[PDB]
Amino acid sequence: TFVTVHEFAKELDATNISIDKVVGAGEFGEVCSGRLKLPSKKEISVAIKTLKVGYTEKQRRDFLGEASIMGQFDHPNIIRLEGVVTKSKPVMIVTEYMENGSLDSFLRKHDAQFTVIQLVGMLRGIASGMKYLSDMGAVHRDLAARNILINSNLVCKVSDFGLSRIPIRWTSPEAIAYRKFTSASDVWSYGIVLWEVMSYGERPYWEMSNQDVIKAVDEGYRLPPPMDCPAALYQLMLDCWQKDRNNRPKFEQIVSILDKLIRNPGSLKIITSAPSNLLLDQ
Known part of the structure; x- marks a missing residue:
């Protein structure tokens, strides 16, 4: 609406x-x-x-x-x-008022200092807000950790609707290619935000040339699993980053995935294995 x-x-x-x-x-x-x-x-x-x-x-x-x-x-x-x-x-x-400011800056100050369940809570809040956005037929177009704000109780909230109805590192390949901005392109961006959160605010694709970010992602390369990243969360990133926008999860499904992880925190103990470089698909 x-x-x-x-x-x-x-x-x-x-x-x-x-x-x-x-x-x-x-x-x-x-x-x-x-x-x-x-x-x-x-x-x-x-x-x-x-x-x-x-x-x-x-x-x-x-x-x-x-x-x-x-x-x-x-x-x-x-x-x-x-x-x-x-x-x-x-x-x-x-x-x-949001006491702890931008999520990316806040996490960079507290590298490896929160629990996996605290991070999953932040991510679930973000997905919940985005689910409502998409229910209302809005496309954010600039979903990034720098545009998520975090309050005194670590509740994360979507901000900065300046671009809403190109941050190349957060933008889906089809949105870069011919400006195809949809909720599924926002799901791509959420996948990057997931990586940003689990990475404690490292910059997506570090300082790779923009042309190389575009080409590498087109060839099937993706951001590697963050250190100590649960397998379930890396898989969720990969699903957000499906080439075909139609195969990406909807925000409602993302909320439900994260609620299941919150419900069964032992799930999160299965970790992805082990050089800022990209992984082909995978």
């Missing part, structure tokens, strides 16, 4: 917003954190983005457009849009 839009975004009163901390700069302006007083008088933490002074109309449209998309989704594993401020300036987008 995925479709200016105050159709999908609450106009917040700026008196209910307080800025506590500037994080840094963003594409469109400053990125900040703070508190929002809800109509019930409950106070919550929030992430706040502003549009730079002297913005062009293109900048305003693209800035608020990403909110119009996010606002269509109400799901525990998709970042919550609290609202926008458009009737006063700077224009603001207010979203759910």
Whole structure:
């Protein structure tokens, strides 16, 4: 059921917003954190983005457009849009606070420090959010660990709908070849996110030339199993990376696979064996 839009975004009163901390700069302006007083008088933490002074109309449209998309989704594993401020300036987008930031950066700080079941929980949350996205007929097109946010309790949530309706390393071969972007191309990207998570945030295909990423994956080469990677999870990656988009799992099937692994954690003890290089198929 995925479709200016105050159709999908609450106009917040700026008196209910307080800025506590500037994080840094963003594409469109400053990125900040703070508190929002809800109509019930409950106070919550929030992430706040502003549009730079002297913005062009293109900048305003693209800035608020990403909110119009996010606002269509109400799901525990998709970042919550609290609202926008458009009737006063700077224009603001207010979203759910996520203390631990981008998943890729967070995992790189904690290499090998979480349990396999903790990682599988993060991955299940991501799949659950993506399942709802696909139910609504949206294609994310930029699913990567850098666009997943993680909160104080390690709950992961899909963010960054700027490209949603080319990050070459996360993009399915058919999407690179002729821009065929579908939910199955998002499943490919999820497969890369799985590798990213199990790798504690290593970069997919490291710094291979982009032309070599395209060609190697076309020839059937794939990212190798991460160190200590459960066999079940490497198989899941390979299934996400099937050449034929029609043979990839659906997000609903991915959630069910991961729920089974959560239910039977001994499953995860079967590990793949043993040089940043690609493996042919396999």
